[PDB]
Swiss-Prot record, chain A:
This is NADH-ubiquinone oxidoreductase chain 4. It is found in: Mitochondrion inner membrane. GO terms for biological process: aerobic respiration; electron transport coupled proton transport; mitochondrial electron transport, NADH to ubiquinone; mitochondrial respiratory chain complex I assembly. GO terms for molecular function: NADH dehydrogenase (ubiquinone) activity; ubiquinone binding. It comes from the Eukaryota. The keyword Ribonucleoprotein does not apply. Core subunit of respiratory chain NADH dehydrogenase (Complex I) which is composed of 45 different subunits. Belongs to the complex I subunit 4 family. The chain crosses the membrane at residues 22-42, 60-80, 98-118, 147-167, 193-213, 224-244, 257-277, 284-303, 308-330, 351-371, 391-413, 435-455. It catalyses: a ubiquinone + NADH + 5 H(+)(in) = a ubiquinol + NAD(+) + 4 H(+)(out). Core subunit of the mitochondrial membrane respiratory chain NADH dehydrogenase (Complex I) which catalyzes electron transfer from NADH through the respiratory chain, using ubiquinone as an electron acceptor. Essential for the catalytic activity and assembly of complex I.
């Protein structure tokens, strides 16, 4: 891991001392180089996770998610040198400083060998993000969005902190391994129930949650594009990654005290998907779409089934790559039309042929048609839910309805139809935009050949 | 056959040859609490470092 953590830090002195206009070029190429180094962690033994040292260890869950972060860093850097090149060098250099620091916390968080060690940097990702939304955002409501995002996740993080230190005072160290091997069946006492809520609400408030999803429309829509990918692609998985890591000392209390959360997520995703079917903002439709998929992940964890986790990891990384790509789609129009209303810029296939295509397989991948790992993600969860309860498919499949209508509805409204008459600013798609988007979908299709890597620790 | 004592002799601290033995404990002191045993042994290094959360050393 030191083979990744140190190089990730080393970009920061380099970017801060690179030449005036070499900042993006130099940073991108080594950022791609680091992701190449991070590809080394895909190998996992048929047994205990790769434990490099007491400081850091990686399993078959962290490694697929880790590579997503490292592969991501070129994508924001390559998605941001168009809406920031008009700013001064120091502020541009500071933007790289936040992004590099944001990655470093993610790398350390996903690889933390100690539960409390996980907690610090997993929470510490707030500071680099909160700067991104509030400083470089491009709307007025970004400030209230920053408060909404920061406070909403902090309201759950603190009870987790009290819960984690309590487990320390009662069971000793919270090392992930010793926790797994030293497991005590949780009683149905009232205190254990409240301990269960503290150890869970911090992660469950973080993906979306139906009722706790109000920060995504504020944050994702108002965030800068480089940031906007991160609030939906990777940090939502931090709330995810915590769930499968923490749901090993809560069994069997999670067996019973999960119906209110399972019930909220199952019905909630139908509601929020229905929001997408009747949304006005392109980014908000994408963000609310991320809510429905992420709520599906929330459902998946709470049965504690080998098939459920097996498709849970695949769904998260598949969704994260897609949601980033769709947020690239919103950016492409946003530079030209300078507005986010959907019906403002209809008729893009006639004007931009390839960008229409890039919007095409992006929509199908969100459609979760086979064999794209979005399908292998959802379909695995369906069987796990179905075995848990047969009525689930009625609620399960009904989501597949709405996720079909709004996905093409976003496509049909924007790309197809007559082009907008009064616009005359749409130029040919920059090779940066097309190349970036190919670097999103192509590995996503390339992953389809062997999803054995992305399947997760249960496999 | 007496004599006036000059200044100082009557203020002199003088011993007296007596019979009564020294009291065993004039204050009538009770038994003392046993002091807690003192530390002993070479000051060995702390086992496995600080042992404060994830800090290895
Ligand atoms: C013998 C070998 C012949 C040549 C094989 C060449 C490869 C091939 O087709 O293998 C077929 C084999 C088929 O296995 P097989 O069991 O049929 O055996 C193959 C050998 N023959 C044909 C003789 C039977 O499958 C694989 O090797 C899996 C390839 C998966 C490739 C995945 C690429 C992903 C790239 C990701 C880039 C981005 C990373 C960062 C982001 C990650 C996500 C967040």
């Amino acid at each position: 891991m030191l083979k990744i953590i140190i190089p990730t830090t080393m970009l920061l002195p380099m970017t801060w001392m690179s030449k005036h206009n070499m900042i993006w070029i130099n940073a991108t190429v080594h950022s791609l180089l680091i992701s190449l180094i991070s590809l080394s962690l895909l190998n996992q033994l048929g047994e205990n996770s790769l434990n490099f040292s007491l400081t850091f260890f990686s399993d078959s869950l962290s490694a697929p998610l880790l590579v997503l972060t490292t592969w991501l860093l070129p994508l924001m850097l390559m998605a941001s040198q168009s809406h920031l090149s008009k700013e001064t060098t120091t502020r541009k250099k500071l933007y790289i400083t936040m992004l590099i620091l944001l990655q470093l916390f993610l790398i350390m968080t996903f690889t933390a060998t100690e539960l409390i060690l996980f907690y610090i940097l997993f929470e510490a990702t707030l500071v680099p993000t909160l700067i991104i939304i509030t400083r470089w955002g491009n709307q007025t409501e970004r400030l209230n969005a920053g408060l909404y995002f920061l406070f909403y996740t902090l309201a759950g993080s603190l009870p987790l902190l009290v819960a984690l230190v309590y487990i320390q005072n009662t069971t000793g160290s919270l090392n992930f391994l010793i926790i797994h091997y030293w497991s005590h069946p949780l009683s149905n006492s009232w205190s254990n129930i409240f301990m269960w809520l503290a150890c869970i609400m911090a992660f469950m408030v973080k993906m979306p949650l139906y009722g706790l999803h109000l920060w995504l429309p504020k944050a994702h829509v108002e965030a800068p594009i480089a940031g906007s990918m991160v609030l939906a692609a990777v940090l939502l998985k931090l709330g995810g990654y915590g769930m499968m890591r923490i749901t090993t000392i809560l069994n069997p209390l999670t067996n019973y005290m999960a119906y209110p959360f399972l019930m909220l997520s199952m019905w909630g995703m139908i509601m929020t998907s229905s929001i997408c079917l009747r949304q006005t903002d392109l980014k908000s439709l994408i963000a609310y779409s991320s809510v429905s998929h992420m709520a599906l992940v929330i459902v998946a964890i709470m049965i504690q089934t080998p098939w459920s986790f097996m498709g849970a990891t695949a769904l998260m990384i598949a969704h994260g790559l897609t949601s980033s790509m769709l947020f690239c789609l919103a950016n492409t129009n946003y530079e030209r039309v300078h507005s986010r209303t959907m019906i403002l810029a209809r008729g893009l296939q006639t004007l931009l042929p390839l960008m229409a295509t890039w919007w095409l397989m992006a929509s199908l991948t969100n459609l979760a048609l086979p064999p794209s790992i979005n399908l292998i993600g959802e379909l695995f969860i369906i069987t796990a839910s179905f075995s848990w309860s047969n009525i689930t498919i009625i609620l399960m499949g009904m989501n597949m309805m709405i996720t079909a209508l709004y996905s093409l509805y976003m496509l049909i409204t924007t790309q197809r139809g007559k082009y907008t008459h009064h616009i005359n600013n749409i130029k040919a798609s920059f090779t940066r935009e097309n190349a970036l988007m190919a670097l999103h979908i192509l590995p996503l299709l390339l992953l389809t050949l062997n999803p054995k890597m992305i399947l997760g620790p249960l496999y | 056959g007496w004599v006036r004592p000059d200044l100082g002799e009557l203020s002199k601290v003088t011993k007296v040859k007596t019979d009564r033995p020294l009291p065993e404990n004039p204050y009538h002191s009770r038994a003392r609490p046993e002091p807690n045993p003192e530390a002993e042994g070479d000051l060995k290094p702390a086992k496995h470092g600080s042992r404060l959360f994830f800090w290895t050393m």
